[PDB]
Every structure is written in C-alpha cells, then in structure tokens.
C-alpha cells in the first residue's frame, strides 16, 4: 500500500562503454544493466487518479540532460549573464540510446494501462512496475520524435484546455517519417528534409475531424507562429552534433486537406532546412558558438511520434478556434511518454 510521493529515481541501460558516443559512455557509467524478469501483477476492479504534470522524473531527466549539456557541450564560445567564454570547440560521436528509470524500496511506479488514458484522472486498468520502458531523450521543439505511441487513438494532452497559454501535447497512433540530409560534396550549411505529404495530411485530416468533435464542429484553424526566435519558432534539433532549424510553415496548408484531388499539396515533400552554430540556450543560460562542419555525406532520419502546440487567444469568434505551432518545451518531450506513470511512496 502506498500514498502519492515524490522521490529520486535511478536509471538503467545496456549502454556500451567503448562507444565514445556520449549516451553509451554516460549510461555505461550512470545507469545499470536491466532486470531480465520484472514482475507485474494487475489489481482487479481498482481505479486510481493520475497527474502527468508532476513527476520529478521529468525534473530529474531535464536536470540531468541540462547538467550534461552544460558540462559536455562546451561551445567554442559562450555568452552568459555577465561572463564571456572562449575555446577550441572539437567534434563528437553522437547517438542516443534508450533509458529506463527505475524505482527503489518504499516507493513503486504506478502505471495507467487504460488504452485511452488522458494522463490525469482515474485509470481503471492500472499496473505497478519496478522500472520504466526505454525513453529516448529526444530533444525537439514543435514536434516530439521517436516516442511511444498510443495503442489505440491519437491522444490529446493538456494542463488547461481553456488556457491557450497551456501547451497541447499530441500523441500519435501513427509514426511519421522525416528524412534530413546534407548531401556529399556551394552552401556548406544547406540541407533539406523530405517528408511524405500524404501520410501526414491523412492522419492530420483524421485529427481535424476528431478535433471538431471537441470543438463543437467549430472551424479548426492553424496559423503561423506570431513571431519569435528560431530556437522557439522552428523545429530545432541536433544531428551528429550539427544544429537544424526547420520551418514548418508548409505543413498547415488548409487547402491541402478536404479530399479534393488537388495540386500544390502533392508528392514527396522536400523541405529546405538550414544550420546555425550560434544559439541562445533555451535554458536561458546564454549564447553558444560551436565549431564548423565535417567534410562529406550528412544524414539524419527520424520517426515523428508527438507534437507541442500553442493556441491563439480571442474568444467570441464562436465559429473558430485558432492554433499556432510550437508548444511548451522538452519537459513535454518527457511528459508525452509519462502520462500513464507516477511515482508513489509505499506506506
């Protein structure tokens, strides 16, 4: 028996020690080997309440990755508060491995196994576990990548539906490929990502159809970011240490939906992207400059599994609700995976 509690978790992995890839070495040193036979017993006709927005596991992962980033990814240059930072800025080996987070004595992890669970509230089908599933510390903005899927419907999650200031996390029931490339051998920073327009607009068509059910069959509207930094306004990410900022403007093509056999909205989509070495860390910690790019063939391929969203304010339109891409932050990246979990203290 238990009571809701927060406590400090630990991590586990099959990280490889010879890999200099940082996740391998790190997890090799900061996390442990797996339990080969973990037990899980279901409790009959029990309902439990959840709150996906407060699980220090999030705080622990964010803190950890931040501490790492602060101590691992020294840029050639950092501009922070009142200090000025200079250095050599070397190349790395980079490739995330799965991380499991596991609980100690006197606490346990509760899991909502309700296939249609929204992340807070009662879960009818609940299980208990010793350790989590493997979570990629996928750093992204706008879009959550390579995450776990809802086993049934696409799931919408949010702290306050009425509050447009509250980020909306979209949980996919179908992965979407994005294929990003700087081809071998002139703009040395120019790259592009190709995505299948059809898969996306189809699922999305379905999401809209679905959204109306929640928005009184009201008009569903996408709008471009009102404005802001590329770091917050674009899907920003890292491939082998190189920094991408990709413009998602082309994606909210309203005219591209209605099953109307149409042009413009078609074929394999090749989106142009560009790289910046110098950024303001969203940690609010300052500015960073990294060294220049490798010679040769550059490629990062990703599966899309989630989305962060911001809503336009301006009630009384009474027909429409307006939305703009961009939602909260990476804590949401960890959150999107955690809606069904909470740590409890055993009593």
């Amino acid at each position, epitope marked *: 028996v238990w009571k809701d509690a927060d406590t400090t978790l630990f991590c586990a992995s099959d990280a490889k020690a010879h890999e200099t890839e940082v996740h391998n070495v790190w997890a090799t040193h900061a996390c442990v080997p797996t339990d080969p036979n973990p037990q899980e017993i279901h409790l009959e006709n029990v309902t439990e309440n959840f709150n996906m927005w407060k699980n220090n596991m999030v705080e622990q992962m964010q803190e950890d990755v931040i501490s790492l980033w602060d101590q691992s990814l020294q840029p050639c240059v950092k501009l922070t*508060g009142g200090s000025v930072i200079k250095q050599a800025c070397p190349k790395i080996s980079f490739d995330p491995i799965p991380i499991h987070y596991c609980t100690p004595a006197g606490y346990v992890i509760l899991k909502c196994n309700d296939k249609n669970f929204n992340g807070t509230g009662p879960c009818k089908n609940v299980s208990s576990v010793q350790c989590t599933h493997g979570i990629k510390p996928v750093v992204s903005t706008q879009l959550l990548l390579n995450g776990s899927l809802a086993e049934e419907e696409i799931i919408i999650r949010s*702290e*306050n539906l*009425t*509050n*447009n*200031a509250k980020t909306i996390i979209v949980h996919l029931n179908k992965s979407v490929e994005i294929n990003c490339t700087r081809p071998s051998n002139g703009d040395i920073r120019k790259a592009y990502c190709e995505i299948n327009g059809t898969k996306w607009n189809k699922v999305l068509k379905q999401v809209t159809e679905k959204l109306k059910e929640h928005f009184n069959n009201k008009t569903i509207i996408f*709008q471009p*970011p*009102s*404005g*802001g*930094d590329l*770091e*917050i*306004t674009m899907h920003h990410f890292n491939c082998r240490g190189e920094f991408f900022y990709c413009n998602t403007t082309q994606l909210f093509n309203n005219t591209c939906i209605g099953n109307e056999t149409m042009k413009g909205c078609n074929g394999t989509i090749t989106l142009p992207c560009k790289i910046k070495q110098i950024i*303001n860390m*969203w940690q*609010g910690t*300052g500015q960073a400059m990294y060294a220049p790019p490798i010679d040769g063939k550059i490629n990062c391929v990703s599966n899309i599994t989630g989305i962060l969203l*911001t*809503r*336009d*304010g*301006g*009630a*009384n339109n009474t027909s429409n609700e*307006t939305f703009r891409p*961009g939602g909260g*932050n990476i804590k949401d990246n960890w959150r999107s995976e955690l809606y069904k979990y909470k740590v409890v203290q055993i009593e």
Partner: antibody
Amino acid sequence: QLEQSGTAVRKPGASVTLSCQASGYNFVKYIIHWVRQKPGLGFEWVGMIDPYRGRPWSAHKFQGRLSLSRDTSMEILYMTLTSLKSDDTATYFCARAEAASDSHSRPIMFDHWGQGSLVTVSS
Amino acid sequence: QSALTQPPSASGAPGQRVTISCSGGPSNVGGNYVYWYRQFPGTAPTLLILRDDQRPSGVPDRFSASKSGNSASLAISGLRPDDEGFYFCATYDSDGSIRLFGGGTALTV
C-alpha cells in the same frame, strides 16, 4: 522591481516602442500581460509576453501588424505597435502571474502593475 | 467568451457599508472570482482580492469576498476615505479566453 516608462507623443498612422523593466526572477517564470488604460476606466488584455523563450502571443487581430520583444539578460522589455491614431491618448500597463506554474501556490493574477506608460497621440 | 456590466461607484459617505459586484455576461458562476484593484497616480494599480490565495504579505483582514450566482459582492462594512479612488474587476474567463475587465468605480462622494 517594476518600472514602466515611455515618452508621450508621436503622430498617427506610424509605429511605436514600449518598455517595462522588472526583476530578473519576475522574468524567470512570469509572462507579462500588457494592458492599457483609457481616460478613467478598466483594463484591456492586448497579449502576453512569456519570460522564457520569447514565444509571443497577442490576439490574431494584428496578424500583419504585430511584433513582440524583450530582454532576458538585461531584465527588460520592449513592445511595438503599428497604426497610431490621433484619438489614441491614454496610459499603458504591464502585469504578471504565478499562474499555477510558479511556486506551489499556483495562482493566476495580475500581481503588481505598471506606473503607467503615458500616451498623447496628435496628428 | 463572457462580457461585463458595471454601475459607477460610489457617491458614498466616509464609513458606511457598501457591496459591489463585478458581473459578467456569464451570469452563472462567472466571474468565478476576480481581482478588484486600487489605481493611483505614479502608483501601481494595486490589487485587493486574490482567489486561490488570500491577501498576501503586507495585507490586512477587512476585505472579504463572497458571491453565489453571478451575484458577486465586493463588500466593505467599514468604508474608508482614500477609497476616494478607482476600482476594477479582473477576469479569469476560465484562464482565458479571453480576459476582460470591469467598468471602474470611485467613491469620494
């Protein structure tokens, strides 16, 4: 802790620039709603400016017209508006909130307010 | 959503008990709560009533808030003179959307 400040008059049709400097911590986790005053009356939400990131928001009603701005490091702000009008004379304001997102108090409200940023708009 | 509708207040007298609501088009639970404000020269317009908190640090007890219906009621048993100033309701409008404000009221009389 909280000083708004601006100059009074410029001609209509044009554009403008507005500050509100505050404490760093208040810049840590508090968005600041800009509101405005009219001769002797109650307030108006214009938009919100987050402390973080700089993810901007204000009503869609300026889509071609609007831009939002700030300063994380210098603990300070800027706003800018288009389409000034001769009738547009009155005081502006800035306001915060812990927002069920600061502390474990978890309240949303306009805690402290601006000294007011005067306006006098004449063609 | 939601609107608002306020009479000017109030040609009172230096002490008598007064009760003023901040009533919105939501004539239901809304405005579910409100912040009523001081609003002075060179000053911060200074809030009076919090919801999800009481009165903060540096705040005294004589201001109580109670409603039912849309029938809000910002109440003073003991009127005061530097209430010779302006006071406005602030909206949650369900933490948006969107947040409105009241008609303002002043009692110097």
